[PDB]
Amino acid sequence: KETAAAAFEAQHMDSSTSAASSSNYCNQMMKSRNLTKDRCKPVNTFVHESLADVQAVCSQKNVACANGQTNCYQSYSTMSITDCRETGSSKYPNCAYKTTQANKHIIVACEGNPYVPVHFDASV
Q1: 48 part of the active site
Q2: Nearest Cα to 99, choosing from 44, 42, 33, 24?
Q3: What residue numbers bound the domain in which 31 lies?
Q4: End-to-end Cα, the chain, rounded Å
Q5: Which domain CATH number covers 61?
Q6: DSSP secondary structure, the chain, as one string
């Protein structure tokens, strides 16, 4: 019942920190954002930039999405991000993730009016 735009923010926005605190960041965040409630979401990226900056990407470099669609955009500059990936051992409901902090460009799919990000495609 949550718009795709809204769901995007909830799953990927983390402007409260400039970067992943510790190796435990993912473990904590995936939970906090309710991403391990029904199952363990296998993968997820958190962006440590302002909402405004992320939304602005929808007006930056147009590229193809992985699915072949063309409403994807690549950020002009690198952003601070935290990649979260579930471990081989992790089994619901004991979800566990490996945290990887980095500075990379992001690619998101945009839609709507206003035209905002609705899906996180990849980081580069």
Answers
A1: no
A2: 24
A3: 1-124
A4: 31
A5: 3.10.130.10
A6: ---HHHHHHHHHB-TT-SS--STTHHHHHHHHTTTTSSS--SEEEEE-S-HHHHHGGGGSEEE--TTS-S-EEE-SS-EEEEEEEE-SS-BTTB--EEEEEEEE-EEEEEEETTEEEEEEEEE-
Q: How many domains would you assign to the chain?
A: 1
- Which of 11, 116, 119, 120 does the annotation list as catalytic? 119
Q: Which of 9, 12, 29, 106 is labelled catalytic?
A: 12
- 41's CB contacts (< 8 A; 6+ apart) are 30, 35, 86
Which method, experimentally, gave rise to this model? X-ray
Q: Is 105 a catalytic residue?
A: no
